[PDB]
Amino acid sequence: PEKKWLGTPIEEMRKMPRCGIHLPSLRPSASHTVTVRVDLLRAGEVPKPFPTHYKDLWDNKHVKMPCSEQNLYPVTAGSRWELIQTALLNKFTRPQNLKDAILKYNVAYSKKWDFTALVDFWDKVLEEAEAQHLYQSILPDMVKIALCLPNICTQPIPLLKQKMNHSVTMSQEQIASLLANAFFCTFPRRNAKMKSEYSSYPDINFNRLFEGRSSRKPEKLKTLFCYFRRVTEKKPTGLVTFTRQSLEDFPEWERCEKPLTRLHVTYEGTIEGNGRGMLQVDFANRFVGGGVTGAGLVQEQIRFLINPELIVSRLFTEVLDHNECLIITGTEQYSEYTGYAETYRWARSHEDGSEKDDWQRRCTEIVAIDALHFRRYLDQFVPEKVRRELNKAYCGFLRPGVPSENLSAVATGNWGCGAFGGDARLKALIQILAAAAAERDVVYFTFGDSELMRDIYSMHTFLTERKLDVGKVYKLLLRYYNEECRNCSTPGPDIKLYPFIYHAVESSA
Ligand SMILES: Nc1ncnc2c1ncn2[C@@H]1O[C@H](COP(=O)(O)O)[C@@H](O)[C@H]1O[C@H]1O[C@H](COP(=O)(O)O)[C@@H](O)[C@H]1O
């Protein structure tokens, strides 16, 4: 019978906090927005905002806050925030009470936003006692933190636009307020389908969480209400950093002399569970988070639901271009789940026991890197497409300025494979080569595919023992393309990639 894991023992891999650099004092800079009082930051205490009082910016460089005086609405043009306050400061006892509240300042979507999933969750899924707790405690507590936004999020939040290399660090507390606003659908200019300014950003308002008849919706609702109950009952004290990274220059893949690094590969375990303290890959949509409140419930959405603080990146993160990624450090896990996609179920609250770094960020680092979709299988072997995926992965893994010995292993798996069209064996090798270029080790989860585990180890062991560096491996991929793919008249070649690599090397001088 197969072994459960192969390669370097997972305990020998680097992880946070042990491997981390000594952090300089947290401070704002031209590259780093920081929305809390760094001099007052103390372990276990709720961070205080900077500035002390609300400052507004309503422009094309910053989040358009619902509490802005420039957020206007017909009442003559009146304050939309005053309308939001009035709508939400009402008793809810029936689901239509919450619908009608949200629609008071979203009149234009009265027909377009269905609330069937909210109604059925409230009336059918929840027992009487749980519904009562929802409407007597949770929802009013959520309203309270939502309407505290201007006192909590005092500093304008910059948009992380394409090409920016920039970080925003905010408190978990600040994020809870923003997410409660998202729940009540309060963010202006983020709703219309013919929207202009924000067409290149993901959705942020949670309206689609309430729509349709999917058996998925109640599970998303339980998962998010789990979060909201936690943060309203006990205010979180940590910080979270969101970093957009965009590289213009990449390895010379055909000539790269860096050796392959260590591999641990296994068909059991999870990225979020067994890759604790490691760089955890989110198989992202380029609109980070993808359909987190929509239909989608695969690897990304699941992660955005169990660590809901990730969802706030949608407020300010422009769609990723080919050479970009989003790095999020410090999100907390609030829920546990069982299953996946159509079998996903909220299981219970999670009490996150992760250590915090010196900026009071949980030692949990997640990187969103979007694979390409391959609607024609052979497209992915074309060198341009190999390079694209190498470069995307490389960008997700590289930490400029940071010594390699201070980098954790990368915890990843079958990125963009399955119904997205990626080839698992090609994608494994791509991420192994990108990790090698970034001088990181790899922890690879094959999620039940033991033969794939075996094949990836065998290949990695062969290339390692035969001392082929990144460039030599890359050159073999170009050989496979040129000799077996370029003129292939079938959907896939007769000779597969790993068999080709073995034969090529075994045939060589
Ligand atoms: N994220 C931040 N951005 C900008 N300044 C900050 C931040 N965090 C702390 N400071 C400031 O850096 C200083 C610490 O610098 P040292 O550690 O080197 O000494 C802090 O005192 C903070 O000062 C400002 O906040 C205060 C607001 O006061 P009221 O508006 O309520 O009157 C005011 O003093 C103002 O100057």
Author numbering: 442 to 516, 524 to 957
From the article:
To understand what caused the activity difference between the mPARG E748N/Q and E749N/Q mutants, we solved the crystal structures of these mPARG mutants. Interestingly, while E748N and E749N mutants were completely dead, both E748Q and E749Q mutants still retained residual PARG activities. PARG E748Q and E749Q mutants have very similar conformation in the active site, consistent with the fact that glutamine has the similar size of side chain with glutamate. To study the enzymatic mechanism of mPARG, we tried to soak the catalytic residue Glu748, Glu749 mutants E748N, E748Q, E749N and E749Q with the iso-ADPr, which may be the smallest PARG substrate containing the α(1→2) ribose-ribose glycosidic bond to be cleaved by PARG. In all above four PARG mutant crystal structures, we were not able to observe the electron density for iso-ADPr at the “active” site of mPARG. For the E748Q and E749Q mutants, this may result from the partial catalytic activities of these mutations and/or the low affinity between PARG and iso-ADPr. Surprisingly, we repeatedly observed electron densities, in an unexpected position, which fit well with the chemical structure of iso-ADPr and refined well when iso-ADPr was built into the densities. In these structures, iso-ADPr sits at the secondary binding site which is far away from the cleft. This secondary binding site is at the mouse PARG exon 5 coded region, and is not formed due to crystal packing as it is far away from any PARG region involved in crystal packing. There are four residues (R478, D480, F491 and T493) directly interacting with iso-ADPr.
Reversal of PARylation is predominantly carried out by poly(ADP-ribose) glycohydrolase (PARG) in nucleus and cytosol, whereas ADP-ribosylhydrolase 3 (ARH3) may play a role in mitochondrial PAR degradation. PARG comprises an N-terminal regulatory/targeting domain and a C-terminal catalytic domain. The mouse PARG catalytic domain has a bean-shaped structure, with the active site in a deep cleft in the middle on the abdominal side.
